[PDB]
Amino acid sequence: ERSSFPRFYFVGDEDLLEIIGNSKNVAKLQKHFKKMFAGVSSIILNEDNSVVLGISSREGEEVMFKTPVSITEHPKINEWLTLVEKEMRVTLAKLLAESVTEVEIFGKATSIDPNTYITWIDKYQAQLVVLSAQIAWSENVETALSSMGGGGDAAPLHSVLSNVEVTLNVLADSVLMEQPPLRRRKLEHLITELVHQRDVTRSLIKSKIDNAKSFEWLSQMRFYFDPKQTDVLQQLSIQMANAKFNYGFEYLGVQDKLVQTPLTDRCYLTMTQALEARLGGSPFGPAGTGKTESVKALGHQLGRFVLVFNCDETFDFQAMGRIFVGLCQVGAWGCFDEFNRLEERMLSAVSQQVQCIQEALREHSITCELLNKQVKVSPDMAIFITMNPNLPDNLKKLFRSLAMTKPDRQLIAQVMLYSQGFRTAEVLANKIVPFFKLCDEQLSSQSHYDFGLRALKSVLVSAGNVKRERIQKIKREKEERGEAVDEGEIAENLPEQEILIQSVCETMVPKLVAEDIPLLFSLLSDVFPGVQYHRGEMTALREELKKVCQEMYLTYGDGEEVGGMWVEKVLQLYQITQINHGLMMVGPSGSGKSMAWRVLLKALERLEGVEGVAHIIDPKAISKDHLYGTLDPNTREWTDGLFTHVLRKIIDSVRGELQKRQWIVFDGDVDPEWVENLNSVLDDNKLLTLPNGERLSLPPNVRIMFEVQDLKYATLA
Amino acid sequence: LFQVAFNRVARGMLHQDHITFAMLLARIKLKGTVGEPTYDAEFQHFLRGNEIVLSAGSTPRIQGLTVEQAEAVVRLSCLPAFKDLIAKVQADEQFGIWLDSSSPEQTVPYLWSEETPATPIGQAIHRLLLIQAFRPDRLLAMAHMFVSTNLGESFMSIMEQPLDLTHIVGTEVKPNTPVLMCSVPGYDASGHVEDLAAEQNTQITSIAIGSAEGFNQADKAINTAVKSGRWVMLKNVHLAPGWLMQLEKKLHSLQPHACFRLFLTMEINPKVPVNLLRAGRIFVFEPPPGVKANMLRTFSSIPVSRICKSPNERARLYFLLAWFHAIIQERLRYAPLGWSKKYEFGESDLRSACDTVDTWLDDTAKGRQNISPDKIPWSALKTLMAQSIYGGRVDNEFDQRLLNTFLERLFTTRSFDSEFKLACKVDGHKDIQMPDGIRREEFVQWVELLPDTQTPSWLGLPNNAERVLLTTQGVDMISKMLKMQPAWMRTLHTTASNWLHLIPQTLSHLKRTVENIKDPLFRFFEREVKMGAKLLQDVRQDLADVVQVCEGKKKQTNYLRTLINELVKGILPRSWSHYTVPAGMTVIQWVSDFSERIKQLQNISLAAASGGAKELKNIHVCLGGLFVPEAYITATRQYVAQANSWSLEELCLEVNVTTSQGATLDACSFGVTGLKLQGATCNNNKLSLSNAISTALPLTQLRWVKQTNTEKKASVVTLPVYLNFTRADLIFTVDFEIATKEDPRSFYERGVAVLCT
Amino acid sequence: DPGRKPLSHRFLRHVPVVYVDYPGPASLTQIYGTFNRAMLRLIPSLRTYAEPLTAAMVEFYTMSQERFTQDTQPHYIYSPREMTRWVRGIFEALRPLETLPVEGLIRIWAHEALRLFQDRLVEDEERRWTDENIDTVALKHFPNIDREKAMSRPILYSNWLSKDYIPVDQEELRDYVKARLKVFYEEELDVPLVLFNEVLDHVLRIDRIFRQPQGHLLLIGVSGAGKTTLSRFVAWMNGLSVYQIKVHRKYTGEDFDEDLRTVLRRSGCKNEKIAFIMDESNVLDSGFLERMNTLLANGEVPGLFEGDEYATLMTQCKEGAQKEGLMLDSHEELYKWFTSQVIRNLHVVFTMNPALFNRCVLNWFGDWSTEALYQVGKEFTSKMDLEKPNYIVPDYMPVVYDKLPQPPSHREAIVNSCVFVHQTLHQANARLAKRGGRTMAITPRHYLDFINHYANLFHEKRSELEEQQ
Numbered sequence A: 001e002r003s004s005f006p007r008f009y010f011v012g013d014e015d016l017l018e019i020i021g022n023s024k025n026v027a028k029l030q031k032h033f034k035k036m037f038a039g040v041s042s043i044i045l046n047e048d049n050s051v052v053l054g055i056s057s058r059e060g061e062e063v064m065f066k067t068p069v070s071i072t073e074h075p076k077i078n079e080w081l082t083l084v085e086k087e088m089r090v091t092l093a094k095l096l097a098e099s100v101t102e103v104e105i106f107g108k109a110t111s112i113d114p115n116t117y118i119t120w121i122d123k124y125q126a127q128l129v130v131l132s133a134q135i136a137w138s139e140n141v142e143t144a145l146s147s148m149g150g151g152g153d154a155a156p157l158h159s160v161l162s163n164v165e166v167t168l169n170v171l172a173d174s175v176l177m178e179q180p181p182l183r184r185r186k187l188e189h190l191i192t193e194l195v196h197q198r199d200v201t202r203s204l205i206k207s208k209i210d211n212a213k214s215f216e217w218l219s220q221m222r223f224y225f226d227p228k229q230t231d232v233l234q235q236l237s238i239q240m241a242n243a244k245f246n247y248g249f250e251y252l253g254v255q256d257k258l259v260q261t262p263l264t265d266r267c268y269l270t271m272t273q274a275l276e277a278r279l280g281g282s283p284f285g286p287a288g289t290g291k292t293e294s295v296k297a298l299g300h301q302l303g304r305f306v307l308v309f310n311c312d313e314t315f316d317f318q319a320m321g322r323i324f325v326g327l328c329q330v331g332a333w334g335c336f337d338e339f340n341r342l343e344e345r346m347l348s349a350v351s352q353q354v355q356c357i358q359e360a361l362r363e364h365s366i367t368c369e370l371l372n373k374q375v376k377v378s379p380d381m382a383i384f385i386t387m388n389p390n391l392p393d394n395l396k397k398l399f400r401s402l403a404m405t406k407p408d409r410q411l412i413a414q415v416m417l418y419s420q421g422f423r424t425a426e427v428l429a430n431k432i433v434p435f436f437k438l439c440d441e442q443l444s445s446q447s448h449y450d451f452g453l454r455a456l457k458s459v460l461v462s463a464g465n466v467k468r469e470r471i472q473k474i475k476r477e478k479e480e481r482g483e484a485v486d487e488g489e490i491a492e493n494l495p496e497q498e499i500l501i502q503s504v505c506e507t508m509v510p511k512l513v514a515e516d517i518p519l520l521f522s523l524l525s526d527v528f529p530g531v532q533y534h535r536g537e538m539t540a541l542r543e544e545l546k547k548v549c550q551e552m553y554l555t556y557g558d559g560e561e562v563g564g565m566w567v568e569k570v571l572q573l574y575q576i577t578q579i580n581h582g583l584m585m586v587g588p589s590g591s592g593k594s595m596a597w598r599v600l601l602k603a604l605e606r607l608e609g610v611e612g613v614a615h616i617i618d619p620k621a622i623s624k625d626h627l628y629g630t631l632d633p634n635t636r637e638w639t640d641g642l643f644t645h646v647l648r649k650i651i652d653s654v655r656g657e658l659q660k661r662q663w664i665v666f667d668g669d670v671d672p673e674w675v676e677n678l679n680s681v682l683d684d685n686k687l688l689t690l691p692n693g694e695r696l697s698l699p700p701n702v703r704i705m706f707e708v709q710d711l712k713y714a715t716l717a
Numbered sequence B: 001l002f003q004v005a006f007n008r009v010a011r012g013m014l015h016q017d018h019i020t021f022a023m024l025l026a027r028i029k030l031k032g033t034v035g036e037p038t039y040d041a042e043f044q045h046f047l048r049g050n051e052i053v054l055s056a057g058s059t060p061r062i063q064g065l066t067v068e069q070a071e072a073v074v075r076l077s078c079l080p081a082f083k084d085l086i087a088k089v090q091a092d093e094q095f096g097i098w099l100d101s102s103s104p105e106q107t108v109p110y111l112w113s114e115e116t117p118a119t120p121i122g123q124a125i126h127r128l129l130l131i132q133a134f135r136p137d138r139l140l141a142m143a144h145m146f147v148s149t150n151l152g153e154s155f156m157s158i159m160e161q162p163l164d165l166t167h168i169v170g171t172e173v174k175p176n177t178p179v180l181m182c183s184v185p186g187y188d189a190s191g192h193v194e195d196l197a198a199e200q201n202t203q204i205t206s207i208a209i210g211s212a213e214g215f216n217q218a219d220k221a222i223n224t225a226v227k228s229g230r231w232v233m234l235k236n237v238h239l240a241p242g243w244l245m246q247l248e249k250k251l252h253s254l255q256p257h258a259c260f261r262l263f264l265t266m267e268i269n270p271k272v273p274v275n276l277l278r279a280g281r282i283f284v285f286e287p288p289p290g291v292k293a294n295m296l297r298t299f300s301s302i303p304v305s306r307i308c309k310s311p312n313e314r315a316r317l318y319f320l321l322a323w324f325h326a327i328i329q330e331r332l333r334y335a336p337l338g339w340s341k342k343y344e345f346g347e348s349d350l351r352s353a354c355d356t357v358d359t360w361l362d363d364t365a366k367g368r369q370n371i372s373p374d375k376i377p378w379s380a381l382k383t384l385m386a387q388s389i390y391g392g393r394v395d396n397e398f399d400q401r402l403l404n405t406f407l408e409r410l411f412t413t414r415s416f417d418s419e420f421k422l423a424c425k426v427d428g429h430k431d432i433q434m435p436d437g438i439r440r441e442e443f444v445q446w447v448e449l450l451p452d453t454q455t456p457s458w459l460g461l462p463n464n465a466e467r468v469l470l471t472t473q474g475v476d477m478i479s480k481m482l483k484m485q486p487a488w489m490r491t492l493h494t495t496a497s498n499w500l501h502l503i504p505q506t507l508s509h510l511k512r513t514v515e516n517i518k519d520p521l522f523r524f525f526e527r528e529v530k531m532g533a534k535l536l537q538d539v540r541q542d543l544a545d546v547v548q549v550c551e552g553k554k555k556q557t558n559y560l561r562t563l564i565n566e567l568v569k570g571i572l573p574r575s576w577s578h579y580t581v582p583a584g585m586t587v588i589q590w591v592s593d594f595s596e597r598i599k600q601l602q603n604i605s606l607a608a609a610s611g612g613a614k615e616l617k618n619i620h621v622c623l624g625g626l627f628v629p630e631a632y633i634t635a636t637r638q639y640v641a642q643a644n645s646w647s648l649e650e651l652c653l654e655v656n657v658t659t660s661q662g663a664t665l666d667a668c669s670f671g672v673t674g675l676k677l678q679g680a681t682c683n684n685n686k687l688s689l690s691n692a693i694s695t696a697l698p699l700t701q702l703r704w705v706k707q708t709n710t711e712k713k714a715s716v717v718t719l720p721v722y723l724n725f726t727r728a729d730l731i732f733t734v735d736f737e738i739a740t741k742e743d744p745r746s747f748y749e750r751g752v753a754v755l756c757t
Numbered sequence C: 001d002p003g004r005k006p007l008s009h010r011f012l013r014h015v016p017v018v019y020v021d022y023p024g025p026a027s028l029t030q031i032y033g034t035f036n037r038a039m040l041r042l043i044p045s046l047r048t049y050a051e052p053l054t055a056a057m058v059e060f061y062t063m064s065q066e067r068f069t070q071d072t073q074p075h076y077i078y079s080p081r082e083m084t085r086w087v088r089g090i091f092e093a094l095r096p097l098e099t100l101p102v103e104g105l106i107r108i109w110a111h112e113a114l115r116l117f118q119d120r121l122v123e124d125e126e127r128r129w130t131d132e133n134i135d136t137v138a139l140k141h142f143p144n145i146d147r148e149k150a151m152s153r154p155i156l157y158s159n160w161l162s163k164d165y166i167p168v169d170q171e172e173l174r175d176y177v178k179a180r181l182k183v184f185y186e187e188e189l190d191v192p193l194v195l196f197n198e199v200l201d202h203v204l205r206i207d208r209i210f211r212q213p214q215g216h217l218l219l220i221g222v223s224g225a226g227k228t229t230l231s232r233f234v235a236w237m238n239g240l241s242v243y244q245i246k247v248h249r250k251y252t253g254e255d256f257d258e259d260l261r262t263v264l265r266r267s268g269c270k271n272e273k274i275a276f277i278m279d280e281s282n283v284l285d286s287g288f289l290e291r292m293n294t295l296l297a298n299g300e301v302p303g304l305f306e307g308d309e310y311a312t313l314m315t316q317c318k319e320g321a322q323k324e325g326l327m328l329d330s331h332e333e334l335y336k337w338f339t340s341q342v343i344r345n346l347h348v349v350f351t352m353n354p355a356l357f358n359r360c361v362l363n364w365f366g367d368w369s370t371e372a373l374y375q376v377g378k379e380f381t382s383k384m385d386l387e388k389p390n391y392i393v394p395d396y397m398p399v400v401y402d403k404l405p406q407p408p409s410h411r412e413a414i415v416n417s418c419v420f421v422h423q424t425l426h427q428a429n430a431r432l433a434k435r436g437g438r439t440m441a442i443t444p445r446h447y448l449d450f451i452n453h454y455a456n457l458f459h460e461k462r463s464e465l466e467e468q469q
């Protein structure tokens, strides 16, 4: 059973036995589909649950099959799983062909109708719209170069650059106005992709390239689609420099895309040559510079699915070996995280394993012995190992290297800011990145501080959302007073330095200690001179706070007055609850936390009219198994844990608690043992997973809230 | 006894340690003979000169003598035999010519004054002291000459000869003993023993060590060969230290056949168990340090069939690749100058480069006998060898710039002209010439007929690079021999007392004020003062604990135990080192450096107390003195931005190197002292290449000006600024305008840089 | 203190903490003056001396606390628990007896002062200072006493000879202990024991601790000094069953816990008293140390008995209660009865070289002193004829043995030489330690081996030569 459909080599042997037991249950396989695929979260089925209609993602975006596979005709689990994979590949290829036709109709046009562009974008998935954009742009530039090849010929490359420019203006207009978040992500991926295409086209026009075989064009990745090819898998060929690969045609759901940094394209070139030379790459460098992320993005662009083995105490050996042999069978990629953190004997064992597999790969340039099994290594198999300065001696001669010492932060902060519809994106990026360089150094160091590149990306996202909310509010005001509404007119007269300052305030000022606040203000004065941001007080909420403090005997004050700082902290708590579904009120014991959140809950209930119900749970007092729930060794029955119990109670909405506001205050210390299962909620997924397989979605009213005294053992994740 | 001891020991050491061991045997035989005196004073000073502390007033600044030369002169003059050294140096006129002589150790002048004639070994050691004081670059050669004087000139005459491994395997090694061949990375010693087994007509089994099946084959072959008497050979056994310990145990209780021999081809890594190193005869193989030998090795490695393919231009491309690879690899040996850190430019890079050239030239010349030089995909090769290969390991930006300079100078269509210069002014006006041949045989002949007189200019470094390398090797000699030679409690008390005396007592904190908190320079300087105060108090309390333990009034706690042990062995204490420090700096120079840092911080604290931030702006700090100097440059940036209400990103740094006396304190200008230029001389803010090892910049002025948004002139160059000589940390980059007729590519190749200290 | 982790600041925020320290000297004065008056109510003729007895006891306790600080040695802690143990000892002595003059009382008081405040001392001048302080304070508070009788130096208290716990002469005690040794040799293992005064004092100390309930004593001293042998001696002489855990490299925690369960069930169910002798060699893990800490504190460890072991333990407890005459059904009452049985019947003794300290009794065996070594020398070099008529007394004698006769005979001089050779071995090892070189601890097992080698060599060579003679 294991050899056929090797995709469940990823899932555990006990989980394999679970799948064999639940073979006559398709509704219990969703966890396994989560495990073995990239972004697939569940297969869409009809009410009969006898034919699989399509697949979905964690984000809810779903793919419909051209020819659905009837499980009744193929009762064997492996047969219809293989049919599902083959049909998902075929459907992805056909949808890609359709979308590429649509865009090449859209391309080579003087102007783009926003309605048609938005319609096409909604028609296909994020990965497919980005890939069709890339195929169309590559074919256009190749055709322009072929026309230019006459020698000193006039340039239609100017025309291609103009087409990309007008499409970019279309996207910068569209992202500005309110959109569904999924289409927002599609637009962001498309705009960053097109910014990269514009910059490479500008490089081409500056270098005055004339020949389609000139190496300057050869270096940049080229996408060739061949619709005439009978095999749908090979129709797309992605080629960079000498190397050429086929598209994996595996579903990615929706993924965070990269800005395609000069360092990122350098890494793309080095890795692509390495796999062309039939050996993996080891992009070492300090942690947090996008090494793992760059490998993931490269695998995603190829259409292949990456396994990020995080190498820490949680790292295993038997599970790693089985998922490794599965990697070898299927052909998916595998990117180890920090390797120097492994145990020395652990390190030697995995090093010998990957050395054997790599020798098999160079032999294929064909089976190798894994767990006493000969495994036909797929030629598409790739292994990457990031490091934090080295590579074991048995691997130095098998793997290339690269120093991702410093990703270009200015380019990232400019591309992402432009992706949020910001005008003057370059100025704002060149201001914000040195500011975050200042923050990581001049500020007093703390454990909870994080001025990494990811924090910068999050601040940019928050600023984009703030700008959207401001334009929505101004549109409402203009509708009330007058009727002259024009999105571009509002945007032009909309300051953006103030927006960035407000975003950085709302995200970073709360994390500051009582001394770093003047330092942050001085840094804002230095980098963004003359521009200041004053948070608009919530006067109704301030009055509710005063009344609640009177009712609770607590003290109240405004700013300088006694209790002013506590009041400000309560207001920041409210803002974070507005903009985040997960919170942590860090502070030394007896600082403000319990009283602050209680007072805010009561004032909110007395203001908005929504009842406030809190489930104060101490995580350490109860055992971890009892916190989330116990597993029956025989019947697998779910004795839902305390947190699982309260979440299920709120979900069932027996007494209208969905209308009520629910705060799950996790008073107590925090460690990376229980919070590992709760990390699946604090992300944008906002869903809880359980070891039986049933998954519960967090209702919007539920606010997960951690009242902790200190973060010496809180994971930065 | 002495000869066989050296010729059996040095056969298993690094080539640099041969002279160390020979000089140790020289000391032994000097003590063994009775006629010669003890020479305790001479050897003690020859090993402990640099520990004697001097003063600025102690240096008379004698004409024709550098500063360090003056220090060495006076330090030798402290000895009674060299008391009149200064008088003879100033009186002599022939001294100036001998000082810069090519080989001054051969004709060492008679300067030391004595009442009675000395033995030849005594004159040899006096001249050793003279060479160490004056021309330490020649100290390796002078130690060679001293050993030749003492144990005979032909004492070493064996190590130059190829290792006669036939006579060493036939006898003088027991069949139970394993033969150990520990070769440095980038080399394999398997060839020599394959030729041996061939010439002895001995059937040898060659097993590699890669996995468990390798272990099984190795054990089976050992079990067969122990009785059959044949030879067995294992490759890269450093991969399995535990299995190697097991093999040690297996062989220990195992009688072999007379003809049985066990060879373990190995790599030199500390992962090898100590027990085998003790239980087997070791042999060290190092590749010959030569550009010509490197090219020969490269061409021998590459099969002749591959290099002679359909495009006749392939041979020239392969020769250029081999030359570039040799240039990089032999630049590696000059680590501070040729690079900033030792990269692994091993054979894998060259093999991948060969494959890259092969596939690209197959692409461009689709089965054509000849292909035009302009059609050569020069940009493809340059880009790949600049980014993918030879560039992946390159992390520093400036090392990448240097690699780009080499690739653009070599890889071009211009190489295929008969007048192409692979190097320029290697000696005088002479320069190397690209061979005019088109076949591999011609290039191999040309490299074989190389002048065999490689200087640093051959591979692009200044000719003083060899002198610096020899000085480093001599200092390594001194350190190793010092390592090779209760009372330790009393001496630790004495040295701890000395350090407590020399280190400054206490450092005052800065007074916080709201206007002072606003200023960024005040914030940075108060952070620096706090760090200095905390570390100073830590070290003072640690030394107080140490000295009280020396008088017995306190007992050695575990932390105090580790601290005392580390002080005993001279290793820098971990709790004492919180700021970035050169890797090999020993505790005494660390204490001197820390004393200087606290003196500087005391000066800045006094200046701040006297005035405020406005006076704190005009303090000429030295970037080395500050614990974090890039913090200082960023503080200057923030200060000027705050004073003139500009953005930080729209500011750029301009450098105005002027005299300290002739300096202008502009509101945008900050004084920085102690900067030194490696490989160049700056006059009126103009770069000029020179052979001086280090030019002291009298006072560097850092001025912040708004971004002019104008493209930089081709005459300006970006100079990396490192804190220390190892060049592992980058502070910032300056931009200097080079003088006329100068090539920025040469500046990149000669590794010109600014050092904080 | 070790093993005590400060609680979370969140918890400290709630609970007020009040510091309960060692009572002040006046507080102790009253606290134990009440006890002393209640005790001396036994003998009315001595009731007027109760208050000055408390004053002297408090003064001595404060001197010992102020002089023997914990910094010098980890076990130099004196709590009011020691004073309570002092009063309890004086009471246990005075109970079976009906009358005593003041001198007998002060002899008992000084005996308990020696057994509590001096038995734990490592260095000898500390013991001399303790004896001097005891004599001085007995003089100050109790002036009208015959100091010769009250604090006569051989303060040896035993009950093996008399019916009661009256003082015992060291010579008569030596005769009795010799007879009991003869029985020990005849029945148990046979090795020679020479009875220096140190063995007399130490056997008395071990027996005193054994006889009391919850008896736990800390046998700290250099290896080979006789700690485990004296322990087995007192165990057999007192009826107690000696038990040491057979420990080797395989001996993990589970085997230790199984042995723990065996000894616990034997001393809590069968009402069989067991002397548990334990050594640092038997402690392969600090887990053993914490388990014994719990056993010594609570009298029983809950972590030993669970599940099937719990059921078997309760079955045994029910059977033992039925045999004894107590009828208990539930598991809790039987558990409490078994805990009482263990705490009354089990005695653990720990051999070495702030909870256990001040919750146990630490006796500093140390090494054999000059007197002991010299008695060793004579007793085992008694057989061979080390008697030379030609011997001439030297004008100067190194006099390594203080009590050597003024004319040294030949045998006395040679045994003095042997004691000197041991002393010089100690001095050489100390010098090697001072210079920092590796040293090796010189034990009396070395002395015994030296004497045995001497006997073998002397016998063999004298035999061959005399055979020629």
Ligand SMILES: Nc1ncnc2c1ncn2[C@@H]1O[C@H](COP(=O)(O)OP(=O)(O)OP(=O)(O)O)[C@@H](O)[C@H]1O
Pocket: A553, A554, A555, A556, A563, A566, A588, A589, A590, A591, A592, A593, A594, A595, A596, A667, A707, A708, A709, C010, C013
């Ligand atoms: N606005 C206020 N005015 C007056 N007293 C206040 C105010 N807010 C809190 N307090 C008091 O300060 C203390 C803080 O109580 P609370 O339980 O909220 O602390 P905490 O910071 O959550 O503590 P911990 O981290 O230990 O759980 C209480 O004594 C509370 O009465």
Ligand SMILES: Nc1ncnc2c1ncn2[C@@H]1O[C@H](COP(=O)(O)OP(=O)(O)O)[C@@H](O)[C@H]1O
Pocket: A257, A258, A259, A260, A261, A264, A286, A287, A288, A289, A290, A291, A292, A293, A294, A386, A407, A412, A453, A454, A457
């Ligand atoms: N090419 C890129 N484009 C945009 N953001 C990036 C890029 N590379 C890294 N980042 C950001 O920097 C962070 C680095 O994360 P990670 O992949 O863990 O770095 P590393 O691989 O060095 O550990 C990411 O969270 C991401 O937000």
Ligand SMILES: Nc1ncnc2c1ncn2[C@@H]1O[C@H](COP(=O)(O)OP(=O)(O)O)[C@@H](O)[C@H]1O
Pocket: C191, C192, C193, C194, C195, C196, C199, C221, C222, C223, C224, C225, C226, C227, C228, C229, C230, C351
């Ligand atoms: N008073 C004594 N007379 C003779 N031998 C003794 C005496 N005390 C101890 N020994 C010897 O010491 C040896 C073992 O001592 P031991 O009790 O094991 O020391 P420890 O208990 O300190 O480890 C025994 O063989 C015994 O003969």
